[PDB]
Amino acid sequence: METVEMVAIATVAGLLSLATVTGNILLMLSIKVNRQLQTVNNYFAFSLACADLIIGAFSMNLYTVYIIMGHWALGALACDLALALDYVASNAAVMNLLLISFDRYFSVTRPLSYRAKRTPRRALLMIGLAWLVSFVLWAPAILFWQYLVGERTVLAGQCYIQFLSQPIITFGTAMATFYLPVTVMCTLYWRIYRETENRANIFEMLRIDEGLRLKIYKDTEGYYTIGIGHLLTKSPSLNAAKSELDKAIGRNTNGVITKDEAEKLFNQDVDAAVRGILRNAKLKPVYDSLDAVRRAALINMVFQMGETGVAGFTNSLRMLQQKRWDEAAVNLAKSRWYNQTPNRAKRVITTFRTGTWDAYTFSLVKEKAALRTLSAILLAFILTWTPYNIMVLVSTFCKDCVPETLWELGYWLCYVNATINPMCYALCNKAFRDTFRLLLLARWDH
Ligand SMILES: CCCCCCCC/C=C\CCCCCCCC(=O)OC[C@H](O)CO
Ligand SMILES: CCCCC1CCN(CCCN2C(=O)CCc3ccccc32)CC1
Ligand SMILES: CCCCCCCC/C=C/CCCCCCCC(=O)O
Ligand SMILES: CCCCCCCC/C=C/CCCCCCCC(=O)O
Ligand SMILES: CCCCCCCC/C=C/CCCCCCCC(=O)O
Ligand SMILES: CCCCCCCC/C=C/CCCCCCCC(=O)O
Ligand SMILES: CCCCCCCC/C=C/CCCCCCCC(=O)O
Ligand SMILES: CCCCCCCC/C=C/CCCCCCCC(=O)O
Ligand SMILES: CCCCCCCC/C=C\CCCCCCCC(=O)O
Ligand SMILES: CCCCCCCC/C=C\CCCCCCCC(=O)O
């Protein structure tokens, strides 16, 4: 390698390492200095930043030395230890991406039962297990394969994993670390998006029909309430109501909350209502037989008159289960319910009749920062890791079709995931972008 080629590689790779270490330290410090970013799902983001910092500071720089020098010059022990660290960190990054996906999946699908289990303590446990599993999977095999086989067949000046002899063995690891995790995370995201779409529609339906209050008010029974009919306490005190509200949210609200915080309390109420319906012998067979649009209409009815109230419409419920919607509409309209709230009742009835959102003009699904960041980090993983994993796939069909130069570029592209991952958080999350800019401007002055 000529002197001009050595300088050019050192500059580009050096600047790449600097951008990787800076971005991941900015991600870690943002969570540390800003309390609003100290959420359970950001514990996994911090854990991912740690794996990416190892890639940026260690893997990128030791690989730059290996490229420039044209061989491994640090010995056999340093080779096995550097490979163990590189593969353990890369595998830990994938496991944190799986931890982000699964956490967001259970918090959107089950916001009541899972949120009782979703604590920093359990997050710290899952983070530690993801790091330990990654260590036990790679490090023993990398260090001790030579002793099992009886010879170290990796030549002096070379540095690669000996247990990955046949490309089919490498393909197995590619299936385990990329192909299967990607399929799982894409399936998870699909269910998350679908659940969010359905839950937002119920939120908008009840916002029109019941009403949304961002400040503490009193219900018909005189009890302190907030959002869309969310009971805070039955105690005749405002301080007791503020205490229950601060406990459920996680900040000093002082009686005033946001639409997003009200949507979070609403989704917990939806799960409690759906839990009731499935436990109710009169409401369970009709709910299971109904589509997502007509299910929301039933929940709306439950929110207004309760479980026993809706269950009292024996003939209407049976006709809805029989898919006789025009006939069910007749019985539901000839009730005390229709006489008390005719506008809300006719909108609910039309929904049962058509199975569409024609009674309300509904907006498209507003994708929150959480959902947006999830697809960004998942698309970033696929983008950067695809070239190397396709090269492994090519190798199984034809032995030496992939040249050494291409493996090197595939490895570099793979490392780029560590660089663009903090950029995804900055692009999708406003709170991250502002903290990043705050930390950088403070470092410049002074
Ligand atoms: C024939 C070759 C065998 C094929 C390999 C099959 C192994 C299945 C692995 C992951 C499934 C993805 C689901 C993710 C949940 C499991 C988390 C886990 O422990 O997987 C570790 C994985 O190696 C981290 O890359
Ligand atoms: C868990 C899934 C697999 C993830 C892959 C595994 C391969 N690495 C590139 C390894 C590059 N490399 C060398 O080729 C020689 C020695 C060396 C020392 C220190 C750092 C790097 C190297 C990118 C991610
Ligand atoms: C050197 C600065 C980095 C440039 C950015 C990366 C762009 C991709 C580079 C591809 C060119 C590498 C291929 C060179 C041919 C020599 C291959 C060989 O015979 O070993
Ligand atoms: C080379 C240096 C790179 C490391 C920089 C990252 C800074 C270290 C992070 C500190 C974490 C802040 C301490 C807060 C502990 C929270 C634990 C808890 O959940 O109770
Ligand atoms: C070589 C050194 C690297 C060590 C690898 C192990 C990484 C383990 C990850 C760290 C645990 C994450 C803790 C979460 C941060 C808490 C932030 C906060 O709420 O204040
Ligand atoms: C369940 C222990 C798995 C070991 C931790 C390693 C991290 C990678 C796995 C991610 C799954 C975490 C999701 C929480 C467990 C729910 C069980 C399930 O439905 O799969
Ligand atoms: C992944 C690490 C593998 C550990 C190998 C050690 C083998 C010996 C077996 C002992 C394991 C028993 C410890 C169980 C943990 C205590 C229960 C708990 O609180 O979770
Ligand atoms: C968070 C990381 C974001 C990733 C950044 C990638 C930005 C891609 C956009 C740059 C424009 C260059 C692509 C132009 C298309 C060329 C098409 C062609 O081949 O003719
Ligand atoms: C199994 C746990 C993983 C171990 C990770 C530690 C890896 C560190 C080793 C490699 C870097 C070598 C340090 C540079 C010194 C070279 C001096 C020389 O021998 O010429
Ligand atoms: C010198 C070795 C280089 C570092 C390699 C890192 C891999 C080792 C893995 C096992 C240690 C367990 C990880 C730490 C868990 C604590 C974090 C937490 O639980 O929040």
Residue numbers in the entry: 20 to 219, 1002 to 1161, 354 to 439
The paper states:
Based on its high expression in areas such as the hippocampus and cortex and the pro-cognitive effects in pre-clinical animal studies, the M1 muscarinic acetylcholine receptor (M1-receptor), one of five muscarinic receptor subtypes (M1−M5), is widely considered to be a key or mediator of cognitive function and thereby a target for the treatment in AD. To facilitate structure determination, a thermostabilized receptor construct (termed M1-StaR) was generated in the presence of the agonist 77-LH-28-1. The M1-StaR contained twelve amino acid substitutions including a tryptophan to alanine substitution at position 101 (W101A3.28) that was predicted to enable direct access of small molecule agonists, including 77-LH-28-1, to the orthosteric binding site of the M1-receptor. To promote crystalisation, the last 22 residues of C-termini were removed and residues R220−F355 in the third intracellular loop were replaced with T4-lysozyme (T4L).
The M1-StaR-T4L was subsequently crystallized bound to 77-LH-28-1 in lipidic cubic phase (LCP) and the structure determined to 2.17 Å resolution. In this structure, 77-LH-28-1 is very well defined in the electron density map and is primarily held in place via the charge-charge interaction from the protonated nitrogen within the piperidine fragment at the center of the ligand to the negatively charged aspartate (D1053.32) side chain. This piperidine ring system breaks apart the “tyrosine cage” seen in subsequently published muscarinic antagonist structures. Toward the apical side of the receptor, the tetrahydroquinoline-2-one moiety of the ligand makes hydrophobic contacts with W9123.50, L1023.29, Y852.64, and Y822.61 as well as with the disulphide bridge between cysteine residues C983.25 - C17845.50, thereby linking transmembrane domain 3 (TM3) extracellular loop 2 (ECL2). The tetrahydroquinoline-2-one oxygen further makes a water-mediated hydrogen bond with the hydroxyl group of Y822.61. The lower part of the 77-LH-28-1, encompassing the piperidine ring and the aliphatic tail, is sheathed within an elongated cavity, delineated by water molecules which are stabilized by an intricate hydrogen-bonding network, and by Y1063.33, Y4087.43, W1574.57, and Y4047.39, all of which make van der Waals contacts with the ligand. In contrast, the water-mediated polar interaction between 77-LH-28-1 and Y822.61 observed in the crystal structure is not stable in MD simulations. The pentyl moiety of 77-LH-28-1 is flexible, adopting alternative binding modes between Y1063.33/W1574.57 or between A1935..43/Y3816.51 in the major pocket. The broad range of binding site volumes sampled in MD simulations is consistent with the relative flexibility of the M1-receptor:77-LH-28-1 complex compared to GSK1034702 and HTL9936.
